[PDB]
Amino acid sequence: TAWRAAVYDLQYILKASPLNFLLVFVPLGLIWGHFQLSHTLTFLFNFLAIIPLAAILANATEELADKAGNTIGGLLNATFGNAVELIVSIIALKKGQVRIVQASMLGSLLSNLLLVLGLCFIFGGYNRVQQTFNQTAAQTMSSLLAIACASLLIPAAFRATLPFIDGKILELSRGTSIVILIVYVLFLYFQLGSHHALFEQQEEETDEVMSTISRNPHHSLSVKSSLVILLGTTVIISFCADFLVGTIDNVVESTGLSKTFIGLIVIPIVGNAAEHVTSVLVAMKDKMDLALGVAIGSSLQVALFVTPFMVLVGWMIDVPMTLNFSTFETATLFIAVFLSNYLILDGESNWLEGVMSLAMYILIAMAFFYYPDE
Numbered sequence: 279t280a281w282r283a284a285v286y287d288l289q290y291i292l293k294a295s296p297l298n299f300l301l302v303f304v305p306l307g308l309i310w311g312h313f314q315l316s317h318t319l320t321f322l323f324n325f326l327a328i329i330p331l332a333a334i335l336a337n338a339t340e341e342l343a344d345k346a347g348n349t350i351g352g353l354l355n356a357t358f359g360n361a362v363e364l365i366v367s368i369i370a371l372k373k374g375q376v377r378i379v380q381a382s383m384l385g386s387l388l389s390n391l392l393l394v395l396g397l398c399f400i401f402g403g404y405n406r407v408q409q410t411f412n413q414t415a416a417q418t419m420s421s422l423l424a425i426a427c428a429s430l431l432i433p434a435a436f437r438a439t440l441p442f443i444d445g446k447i448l449e450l451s452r453g454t455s456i457v458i459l460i461v462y463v464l465f466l467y468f469q470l471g472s473h474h475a476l477f478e479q480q481e482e483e484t485d486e487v488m489s490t491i492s493r494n495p496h497h498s499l500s501v502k503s504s505l506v507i508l509l510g511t512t513v514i515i516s517f518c519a520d521f522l523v524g525t526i527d528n529v530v531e532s533t534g535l536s537k538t539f540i541g542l543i544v545i546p547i548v549g550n551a552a553e554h555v556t557s558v559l560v561a562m563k564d565k566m567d568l569a570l571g572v573a574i575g576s577s578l579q580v581a582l583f584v585t586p587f588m589v590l591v592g593w594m595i596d597v598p599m600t601l602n603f604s605t606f607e608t609a610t611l612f613i614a615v616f617l618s619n620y621l622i623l624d625g626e627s628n629w630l631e632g633v634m635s636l637a638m639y640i641l642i643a644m645a646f647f648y649y650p651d652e
């Protein structure tokens with residue numbers, strides 16, 4: 279049984295993962311990257327390969343964190359819950375790709391604020407008059423997110439509004455990151471302590487809806503079974519991430535796309551696509567609050583943990599990772615933050631709110647497509 283039960287446990291993980299059909303790009307990604315066949319396809323194949331792995335790793339992390347206990351479980355979600363964003367950004371930092379990391383962090387927020395928002399409102403609202411989410415955990419978390427993004431943008435808004443200064447921007451970003459990371463710890467105490475019931479119920483509800491859609495009885499993987507998949511999926515992602523990051527300069531050169539565009543629009547898809555599909559499917563079950571909850575939760579991690587931690591990592595390995603986003607990026611994120619929060623606060627969405635949000639994201643991507651590289 280110890281062999282055949284391990285097989286079923288693997289089946290349970292794959293069947294709980296939305297876009298598992300893209301796993302076919304894992305060997306292709308590995309082949310192309312290792313043999314260094316063609317840069318553009320090496321980018322694309324690994325790009326496609328990490329997407330299902332993120333979901334696989336997420337379900338492994340979640341299954342492990344459940345039996346890990348309160349304190350440790352939260353640390354696992356801080357770590358392996360953000361692994362894709364973490365791994366890719368760390369590898370990118372180790373190759374001096376500061377702009378890529380900066381754009382990917384902000385882009386991840388943009389995608390969660392506008393893109394998945396639009397998709398959820400469209401797919402959930404096309405066959406309904408409206409969808410309500412008043413007085414839900416989604417609105418609560420949304421308020422926190424509004425402050426989180428604003429805080430993260432402060433050093434950027436600072437440099438943008440300036441009338442030597444190089445070392446001070448670095449010092450400000452690093453001091454800011456310490457503060458935000460203190461907040462993140464308190465956010466964990468909020469999440470796992472005083473308001474544990476709020477997040478727990480939202481998590482259980484989301485799992486229940488996902489089990490309904492995925493159509494497989496909830497099976498709790500053993501610590502051993504989940505830890506293998508966890509460390510297994512992680513090393514594969516690392517390989518694919520390394521290949522993907524190693525081709526950035528070439529893809530930038532072969533195509534006409536800037537590092538900013540690739541970082542802001544392309545890269546975030548990697549760690550969000552699986553979660554986005556999840557959010558959409560839940561929204562179609564007329565449970566927008568849960569759908570929004572997933573997207574808002576991921577944004578909180580990027581804003582409160584991943585982004586400031588990356589500047590800390592940069593400090594450790596002597597790469598000048600900063601919160602010094604471009605002026606347009608700064609302005610854009612502020613726009614997205616206002617609107618998303620306004621839309622989430624109005625309490626009722628429709629399919630048109632989704633069309634327009636989606637259109638705006640496209641318009642932003644279109645604008646960033648014209649953003650100058652030199």
Ligand SMILES: CCCCCCCC/C=C/CCCCCCCC(=O)OC[C@H](O)CO
Pocket residue numbers: 305309313314315
């Ligand atoms: C579900 C998984 C099923 C997987 C089924 C895969 C079957 C083929 C496997 C080949 C692995 C080795 C591939 C080797 C490819 C080498 C590429 C090549 O040789 O190109 C070099 C290039 O010419 C430099 O200039």
Ligand SMILES: CCCCCCCC/C=C/CCCCCCCC(=O)OC[C@H](O)CO
Pocket residue numbers: 448449450452453454456457
């Ligand atoms: C109420 C007003 C309070 C603010 C008043 C201004 C305070 C200025 C100092 C920053 C404190 C931030 C605490 C964390 C400081 C770490 C910053 C740091 O160490 O920077 C070194 C730099 O990284 C080397 O390159």
Ligand SMILES: CCCCCCCC/C=C/CCCCCCCC(=O)OC[C@H](O)CO
Pocket residue numbers: 400404405629633634636637638640
């Ligand atoms: C039964 C009640 C009556 C039926 C209700 C029908 C609902 C309408 C659905 C719209 C799908 C969304 C349309 C596709 C999304 C367009 C987004 C957009 O902005 O597209 C820009 C364009 O792609 C740039 O070239």
Ligand SMILES: CCCCCCCC/C=C\CCCCCCCC(=O)OC[C@H](O)CO
Pocket residue numbers: 308309312313314517
């Ligand atoms: C580190 C991640 C490895 C991912 C593996 C994906 C599947 C590769 C299949 C066969 C391994 C080939 C072993 C090495 C033998 C081929 C020689 C090789 O290294 O080719 C690369 C080329 O030299 C460039 O400089």
Ligand SMILES: CCCCCCCC/C=C\CCCCCCCC(=O)OC[C@H](O)CO
Pocket residue numbers: 389393397401546547548550551554555558559562563
């Ligand atoms: C629930 C009632 C119906 C039951 C049957 C369900 C049928 C689902 C139909 C279409 C799902 C469309 C999902 C669209 C998700 C697209 C999101 C995406 O793939 O990625 C977004 C972005 O590009 C990454 O950052």
Ligand SMILES: [Ca+2]
Pocket residue numbers: 340344481482485
């Ligand atoms: Ca769970």
Ligand SMILES: [Ca+2]
Pocket residue numbers: 478479482
């Ligand atoms: Ca409960």
Ligand SMILES: [Ca+2]
Pocket residue numbers: 340481484485
């Ligand atoms: Ca879950």
Ligand SMILES: [Ca+2]
Pocket residue numbers: 359360549553576
């Ligand atoms: Ca996430």
Ligand SMILES: [Ca+2]
Pocket residue numbers: 623624625626
């Ligand atoms: Ca209202």
Ligand SMILES: [Mn+2]
Pocket residue numbers: 490563
């Ligand atoms: Mn249902």
Ligand SMILES: [Mn+2]
Pocket residue numbers: 621624625626627628631
């Ligand atoms: Mn609305």
